[PDB]
């Protein structure tokens, strides 16, 4: 996975050197930023269900055309498949959030997504309506800590800026 310590040890391995103080300071910043984004990880594992539910409900609240038959979504199965897709995305935000960096998220979710989504008539604007709904429904002090919330923001925005 792309992460702190895998970038540094991958660089030291490609370079063929002993691990000097640079990699040590990198993992120092990993272990110092850690507490915040792990708190965000805890709360994401807390309420993921309602996240996915409001995400998809606001997604079809914006795009009502999908429900009409012949569209991407029209079968108990299709809308079910919408929720499953969103749920996978939030779980990968939780995994990349715990790891740190974009390595876990990028290789599972983003790599090769263009072929799939372009193939299967899947509009990205529905996903982005879901994620920007979650990012607007976020909060500053009430549910989370502000600093960790910034981390959450970053990861969600990354998904948006890898989608369209």
């Amino acid at each position: 996975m792309k992460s702190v310590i895998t970038t540094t040890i991958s660089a030291a391995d490609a370079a063929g050197r002993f691990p000097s103080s640079s990699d040590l300071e990198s993992i120092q910043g990993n272990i110092q930023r850690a507490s915040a984004r792990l708190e965000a990880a805890e709360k994401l594992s807390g309420n993921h269900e309602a996240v996915v539910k409001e995400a998809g409900d606001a997604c079809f609240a914006k795009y009502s055309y999908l429900k009409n038959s012949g569209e991407a979504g029209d079968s108990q199965e299709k809308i079910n498949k919408c929720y499953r897709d969103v749920d996978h995305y939030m779980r990968l935000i939780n995994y990349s959030l715990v790891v740190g960096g974009t390595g876990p998220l990028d290789e599972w979710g983003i790599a090769g997504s263009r072929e799939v989504y372009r193939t299967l008539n899947l509009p990205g604007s529905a996903y982005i309506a879901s994620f920007t709904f979650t990012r607007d429904r976020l909060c500053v002090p009430r549910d989370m800590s502000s600093q960790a919330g910034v981390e959450f923001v970053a990861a969600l925005d990354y998904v948006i800026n890898s989608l369209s």
């Binding site: 992460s3 991958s10 391995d13 002993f18 993992i27 594992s45 715990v98």
Partner: protein, 177 residues
């Protein structure tokens, strides 16, 4: 290559469920541990050359067949290849110390080694002996009980970590055989 984090993440992805608190709790300690691992890696990577010299020298000392003609360490070139192989082994072990998981060691160094030495006729028992000597030397530096060099650190308990390092070298010594 997956580190502590990626190990937890992979396990949770195969389980297809969010990592949650349990996995986050074990992770917190890894994070809460921290600088012990940092200073450990600094100790082994500091005196790394010297570890490799002493271990390979000891390994030639126990059975002098290596430097005997027809042995695999007889040539100056072969002695140099010997030294750089021990160095690289120690290098990957230090990578696995910063990682917390042996996935770097499994993928980058363990993947194709036994076959290589079998193809070149390198005696595997001798290699496991040299891995063992680097294990003892590395644990001696990592506990700061080294008889030559004893540097000041803020004191405490670092036994766990020593058990981890011993596990890495046992992985390599089990692999080469």
């Amino acid at each position: 290559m997956l580190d502590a984090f990626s190990r937890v993440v992979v396990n949770s992805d195969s389980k297809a469920a969010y990592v949650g608190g349990s996995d986050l709790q074990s992770l917190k300690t890894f994070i809460s541990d921290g600088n012990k691992r940092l200073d450990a890696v600094n100790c082994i990577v500091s005196n790394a050359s010297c570890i490799v010299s002493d271990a390979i020298s000891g390994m030639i000392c126990e059975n002098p067949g290596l430097i005997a003609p027809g042995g695999n360490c007889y040539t100056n070139r072969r002695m140099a290849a010997c030294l750089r192989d021990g160095e690289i082994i120690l290098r990957y072990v230090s990578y696995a110390l910063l990682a917390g998981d042996s996935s770097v060691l499994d993928d980058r160094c363990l993947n194709g080694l036994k076959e290589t030495y079998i193809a070149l006729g390198v005696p595997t028992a001798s290699t496991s002996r040299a891995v063992s000597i680097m294990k003892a030397a590395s644990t001696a530096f990592i506990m700061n009980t080294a008889s030559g060099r004893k540097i000041e650190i803020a004191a405490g308990d670092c036994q766990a970590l020593q058990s981890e390092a011993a596990a890495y070298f046992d992985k390599v010594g089990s692999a080469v055989d």
